[PDB]
Curated annotation (Swiss-Prot):
The chain holds residues 144 to 251 of 536 of the full protein. It comes from Homo sapiens (Human). It is linked to SRC kinase activity has been shown to be increased in several tumor tissues and tumor cell lines such as colon carcinoma cells. Thrombocytopenia 6: A form of thrombocytopenia, a hematologic disorder defined by a decrease in the number of platelets in circulating blood, resulting in the potential for increased bleeding and decreased ability for clotting. THC6 is an autosomal dominant form. Affected individuals may also have bone abnormalities and an increased risk for myelofibrosis. Residues 8-105 form the SH2 domain. Belongs to the protein kinase superfamily. Tyr protein kinase family. SRC subfamily. Keywords: ATP-binding, Cell adhesion, Cell cycle, Cell junction, Cell membrane, Cytoplasm, Cytoskeleton, Disease variant, Host-virus interaction, Immunity, Kinase, Lipoprotein, Membrane, Mitochondrion, Mitochondrion inner membrane, Myristate, Nucleotide-binding, Nucleus, Phosphoprotein, Proto-oncogene, SH2 domain, SH3 domain, Transferase, Tyrosine-protein kinase, Ubl conjugation. The gene is SRC. This is Proto-oncogene tyrosine-protein kinase Src. Non-receptor protein tyrosine kinase which is activated following engagement of many different classes of cellular receptors including immune response receptors, integrins and other adhesion receptors, receptor protein tyrosine kinases, G protein-coupled receptors as well as cytokine receptors. Participates in signaling pathways that control a diverse spectrum of biological activities including gene transcription, immune response, cell adhesion, cell cycle progression, apoptosis, migration, and transformation. Part of a complex comprised of PTPRA, BCAR1, BCAR3 (via SH2 domain) and SRC; the formation of the complex is dependent on integrin mediated-tyrosine phosphorylation of PTPRA. Interacts with DDEF1/ASAP1; via the SH3 domain. Interacts with CCPG1. Identified in a complex containing FGFR4, NCAM1, CDH2, PLCG1, FRS2, SRC, SHC1, GAP43 and CTTN. Interacts with ERBB2, STAT1 and PNN. Interacts with DDR1, DDR2 and DAB2. Interacts with CDCP1, TGFB1I1 and TOM1L2. Interacts with the cytoplasmic domain of MUC1, phosphorylates it and increases binding of MUC1 with beta-catenin. The keyword Iron does not apply.
Length: 108
C-alpha cells in the first residue's frame, strides 16, 4: 500500500545500480523498477530495459514528477494518484515509453 511495500520499488539506488540490475540479458524487454530521483529532489525515476535497433540492450530512464498537491506523472496530461497506479497504467500500454512495463526487476 505504501510504495515501500512494492517489489518494483528500489528506493535510493543510483542510476548506475539501476542499469546493472536492468541490463541482465535474461530480463525480458520492459523489465523495470522505480527509484528515487538523483536529479530532481522528491521526484522518482522509472528505469526500463529495452532492446534498441541501433544500440541493443539499453536502459531508458523516465522522470516521474511528484505534485505537492498530490499525484504523479511523467507528463502533466496523464496524471495518477499513486506510483502504484502509474505503474499499472504503463504496464498495460507503452503510451509513449519505449515499451510497456512487463517484468518487475529481479533483485540484487
Amino acid at each position: 500500500d505504501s510504495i515501500q511495500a512494492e517489489e518494483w520499488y528500489f528506493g535510493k539506488i543510483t542510476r548506475r545500480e539501476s542499469e546493472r540490475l536492468l541490463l541482465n540479458a535474461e530480463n525480458p524487454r520492459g523489465t523495470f523498477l522505480v527509484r528515487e530521483s538523483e536529479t530532481v529532489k522528491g521526484a522518482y525515476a522509472l528505469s526500463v530495459s529495452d532492446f534498441d535497433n541501433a544500440k541493443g540492450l539499453n536502459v531508458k530512464h523516465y522522470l516521474i514528477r511528484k505534485l505537492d498537491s498530490g499525484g504523479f506523472y511523467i507528463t502533466s496530461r496523464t496524471q495518477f494518484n499513486s506510483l502504484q497506479q502509474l505503474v499499472a497504467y504503463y504496464s498495460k500500454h507503452a503510451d509513449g515509453l519505449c515499451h510497456r512495463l512487463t517484468t518487475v526487476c529481479p533483485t540484487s
